[PDB]
Each structure stands twice: as structure tokens, then as C-alpha cells.
Amino acid sequence: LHHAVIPHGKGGRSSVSGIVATVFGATGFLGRYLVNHLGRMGSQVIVPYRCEPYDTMHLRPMGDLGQIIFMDWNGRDKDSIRRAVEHSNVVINLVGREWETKNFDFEDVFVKIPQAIAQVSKEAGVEKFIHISHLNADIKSSSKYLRNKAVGEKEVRETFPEATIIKPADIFGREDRFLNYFANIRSLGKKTVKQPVYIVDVTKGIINAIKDPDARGKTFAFVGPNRYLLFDLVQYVFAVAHRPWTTRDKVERIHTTDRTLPHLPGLEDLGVQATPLELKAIEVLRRHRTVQPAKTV
Amino acid sequence: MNLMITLLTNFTLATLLVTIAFWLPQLNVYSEKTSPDPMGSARLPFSMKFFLVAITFLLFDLEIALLLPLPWASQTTNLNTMLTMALLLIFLLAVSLAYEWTQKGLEWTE
Numbered sequence: 001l002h003h004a005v006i007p008h009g010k011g012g013r014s015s016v017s018g019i020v021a022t023v024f025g026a027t028g029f030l031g032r033y034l035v036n037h038l039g040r041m042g043s044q045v046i047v048p049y050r051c052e053p054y055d056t057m058h059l060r061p062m063g064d065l066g067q068i069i070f071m072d073w074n075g076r077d078k079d080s081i082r083r084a085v086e087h088s089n090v091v092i093n094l095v096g097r098e099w100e101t102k103n104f105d106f107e108d109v110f111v112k113i114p115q116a117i118a119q120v121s122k123e124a125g126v127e128k129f130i131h132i133s134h135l136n137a138d139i140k141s142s143s144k145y146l147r148n149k150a151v152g153e154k155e156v157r158e159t160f161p162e163a164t165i166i167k168p169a170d171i172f173g174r175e176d177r178f179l180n181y182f183a184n185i186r187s188l189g190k191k192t193v194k195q196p197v198y199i200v201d202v203t204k205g206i207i208n209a210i211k212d213p214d215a216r217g218k219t220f221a222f223v224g225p226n227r228y229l230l231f232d233l234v235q236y237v238f239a240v241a242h243r244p245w246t247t248r249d250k251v252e253r254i255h256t257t258d259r260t261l262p263h264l265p266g267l268e269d270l271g272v273q274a275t276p277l278e279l280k281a282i283e284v285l286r287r288h289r290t291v292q293p294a295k296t297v
Numbered sequence: 298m299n300l301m302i303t304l305l306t307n308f309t310l311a312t313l314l315v316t317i318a319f320w321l322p323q324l325n326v327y328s329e330k331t332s333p334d335p336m337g338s339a340r341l342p343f344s345m346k347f348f349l350v351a352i353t354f355l356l357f358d359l360e361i362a363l364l365l366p367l368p369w370a371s372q373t374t375n376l377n378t379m380l381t382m383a384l385l386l387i388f389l390l391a392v393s394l395a396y397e398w399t400q401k402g403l404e405w406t407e
């Protein structure tokens with residue numbers, strides 16, 4: 001282990017954690033809190049960004065001087081991926097779109113780009129790789145999202161055999177598109193059962209998966225502590241928010257139940273206690289204001 | 298008819314500009330803003346003086362409403378009576394102002 005990557009300090013902002021992290025997709029929602037929790041340890045966070053540099057400004061106070069290296073990359077340029085990962089000791093993937101675009105479909109975002117990142121990270125000597133799938137990923141799933149994400153998970157597993165693949169159920173938080181989706185829909189109630197996971201629990205799970213050497217080659221299912229039906233969940237969202245852009249793929253995924261995978265470990269086997277919805281939903285939905293808790297199963 | 302067309306045109310231009318001001322920058326997909334004053338949450342204290350200057354406006358505006366036919370009233374044949382009643386109306390407006398003065402009605406908004 002090299003002398004510059006030995007940890008030092010008391011784990012604060014000016015400390016050294018020995019984590020040289022390349023977070024693909026740090027400009028989004030999971031990457032926000034992930035770069036926050038990495039940089040507050042004193043980790044060398046490499047942020048490959050695709051967007052305008054203005055849209056990366058919030059990542060800049062998240063660490064000490066020189067501890068966030070921004071650089072350009074393309075999903076169809078393996079040279080830029082190698083230019084981003086050739087010094088990192090961990091590579092986290094967080095590339096995702098809820099909607100397919102003119103230049104990237106779900107096959108590009110969930111299959112081609114994660115396999116490219118994992119292949120280049122294998123042939124660059126990166127120790128640790130973390131992939132973020134979805135809990136309901138299935139080949140025979142109704143939505144194209146979960147089909148291509150199951151395909152990309154299989155490809156990441158077969159091209160990086162030690163890839164820590166993580167299954168969040170439905171991540172809620174401030175900049176989420178789950179509770180902010182329900183508070184701004186003003187779809188319906190069915191027999192769909194969900195257990196949504198909190199974003200800080202997911203971030204602590206990812207960083208404890210970095211820190212646990214036994215999490216290599218594993219597959220985790222980051223689920224919340226309380227399973228809810230869809231209907232009383234949506235009624236609880238409209239009860240907290242003081243209320244009386246979509247596609248059919250999101251309609252299929254909201255009416256897709258969060259499956260139970262007891263053979264996979266979860267948040268507790270990384271040392272993270274799951275934060276329930278009712279302690280954070282007021283914090284999420286206070287912005288939407290111009291409460292009896294939901295029924296669990 | 299020309300005036301109604303003009304009023305409708307001005308209202309339509311104003312509503313078009315207001316709609317462009319309230320809906321063109323809505324298409325910006327900037328960011329959701331988390332958690333969007335000298336007094337914190339106290340009630341608005343009623344000021345007696347603001348109500349006093351408003352009612353003084355209303356009463357002197359009524360006296361103005363009496364004064365408004367004077368450019369037409371100077372054309373009369375009974376000019377002595379007209380001149381007496383015009384000077385009497387402006388004098389009663391001045392007596393209203395003097396009484397508003399001397400009983401401390403014009404105070405702290407003088």
C-alpha cells in the first residue's frame with residue numbers, strides 16, 4: 001500500500017482517508033450525498049462530469065482543496081473513462097436516467113456505459129468497483145428500465161467479478177423523484193407494496209461497502225425498514241404536504257411492487273440502521289407546504 | 298367603439314406580456330429549491346395614522362368631486378351666485394384642512 005494512500009488524521013475535512021474515488025454520475029442525486037460523505041472524510045474524489053461545469057458547483061464545497069478533481073468524460077469514450085479511473089482505488093457507478101433521450105436509451109445508460117466503466121476499471125487495475133442497480137430488476141419485468149438494468153447488472157457481474165452491486169428499493173430524500181413525484185402528481189392505488197430506503201442510509205451503505213473488504217463480490221439490497229402499500233403511501237405523502245413530466249415506464253415502475261430478497265444482505269450487514277419514512281418525510285415535504293403515520297404491512 | 302377596441306388591445310397586450318413573464322422562465326429546468334423579513338411571524342400592527350390619512354383623502358376627494366364642475370360653471374349667467382358658491386366650497390375645503398391641522402390630525406404623517 002502506497003505511502004500517499006495511507007489514512008491520516010481524525011477523519012475530518014483536512015484528513016486523509018486513503019479513498020481515491022471515481023464517482024461516475026456525481027452530478028445527480030445519489031452522487032450529491034456520496035461526494036458529500038466521501039469528501040468530508042478527506043477522500044480524493046474524482047468527478048467525471050458530462051454537463052455544464054455550472055451544474056457541478058454544489059460539489060465544490062464538499063471537500064478540502066484539491067480533494068475533488070473535476071474532469072470531462074463521455075459514455076461512448078473509453079479513453080476518457082481510462083483517463084478518469086487510472087489513479088483511483090475505488091470506482092462507483094451512478095449513471096442513470098428515468099427517461100430515455102434522443103442520444104441515450106436505457107440500453108446505453110444501463111448496459112453499455114456500466115460495462116464500459118467496469119471493463120476499463122478492470123483493465124486499469126482498480127481495486128474496488130461499486131454498481132448501483134434497482135431492487136426490482138428483472139429480465140421478465142414489465143418496464144424497459146428494469147429489464148436493461150438486470151442486463152447491465154449481469155454484464156457488470158461478469159466483467160468485474162468483485163463488483164459490489166447494490167439494490168436500492170426506492171430512494172427518497174430532498175432531491176429525489178419519489179416523494180417529490182408523489183407530492184407533485186396531485187398515479188393511483190393498487191396492490192403494489194413498497195419499502196422505500198432513505199438516501200443517507202444508501203450513502204452510508206456505499207461507503208461502508210468501500211470500507212468492508214468482505215463486501216467484494218457481494219450483492220446488497222438496500223431496503224427501508226417499513227413496507228407500505230402504494231395507496232396509503234401516496235395518501236401519507238398528500239397528508240404531510242397538506243394537500244387534499246411523466247412516462248409510462250415510470251407508471252409501470254410505481255405500480256411494480258418492491259420485491260423481497262432475503263438471500264441478499266441489506267443495510268444491516270454493512271452496519272447501517274435504516275431510517276424510517278416518518279422521521280424524514282416532514283423534512284422532505286416541508287418545501288411543498290404553502291399527521292397520522294401510514295399503515296405498514 | 299374605437300375606445301373599446303383600444304382598451305381590449307391594451308388589456309390583451311398586458312395579459313400577453315404577463316403570460317410570457319410568468320411562463321417563459323418556467324421552462325427552465327434549473328433545480329428544485331429547498332426551503333424557499335424584519336418581523337418573523339408577528340401579526341401586522343394596525344396603524345391608526347394610515348387609516349386617518351386614507352379617510353382624510355376620501356373626504357377631501359369628495360370635496361374635489363364637488364369642485365369638478367367649475368370649468369363648466371364659469372359659463373353661467375348667474376355669476377355672482379356661482380362665484381360665491383365656488384369660493385364657499387374651496388373655503389369649506391380649507392376649513393376642513395384647518396380643523397384637520399389644529400386638532401392634531403396631521404401628525405407623524407404631517
Ligand SMILES: NC(=O)C1=CN([C@@H]2O[C@H](COP(=O)(O)OP(=O)(O)OC[C@H]3O[C@@H](n4cnc5c(N)ncnc54)[C@H](OP(=O)(O)O)[C@@H]3O)[C@@H](O)[C@H]2O)C=CC1
Binds near residue numbers: 029134169171
Ligand atoms: N430513487 C433513486 O434515485 C434510485 C436510483 N437508483 C439508481 O441509482 C443510480 C443513480 O440514481 P440517481 O442519482 O437518482 O439518478 P440521476 O438521474 O439523478 O443521476 C444520474 C447521473 O448520471 C449522469 N448521467 C445520466 N445519463 C448519462 C449519460 N447518458 N451519460 C453520462 N452521464 C449520464 C447524470 O449527469 P448529468 O446531470 O450530466 O445528466 C447524473 O450525474 C441510477 O442508475 C438509478 O437507476 C436505484 C434505485 C433508486
